């Protein structure tokens, strides 16, 4: 009676644990991957991250400048 009215079967807890373990394992591997990706982008600068501004080339004036040699 106690088992019937207060508790559930073992399969429920077993499969809930399986799902929880999957979630945590993927989170751990994602954390490692993100750390490595951040390190690579900060070192190489070719990624979307750690992009530091440079001078906009639309500011340059391309006209004759009173002297032939610029």
């Amino acid at each position: 009676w106690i088992a019937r009215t207060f508790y559930d079967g073992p399969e429920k807890n077993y499969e809930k644990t399986m799902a929880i373990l999957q979630i945590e394992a993927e989170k751990a591997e994602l954390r490692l991957k993100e750390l490595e990706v951040r390190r690579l982008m900060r070192a190489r600068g070719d990624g979307p991250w750690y992009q530091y501004p440079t001078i906009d080339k639309a500011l340059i004036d391309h006209s004759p400048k009173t002297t032939p040699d610029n």
Binding site: P68, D69, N70
Partner: protein, 57 residues
């Protein structure tokens, strides 16, 4: 890095205009009216090449 190329001293010889700035200023308007074509060719070459060594002729 690299060796700069310069024209020889013989390459820079020309019959020089030996009149002073007052004579030049007095003649300037008719000079510009008459000698426009070679002057314009030289100045176009000068702002297009951006190099004195490419404009000697």
């Amino acid at each position: 890095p690299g060796i700069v190329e310069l024209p020889t001293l013989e390459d820079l010889k020309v019959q020089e205009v030996k009149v002073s700035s007052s004579v030049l200023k007095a003649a300037a308007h008719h000079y510009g009216a008459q000698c426009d074509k070679p002057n314009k060719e030289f100045m176009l070459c000068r702002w297009e090449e951006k190099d004195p060594r490419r404009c000697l002729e």
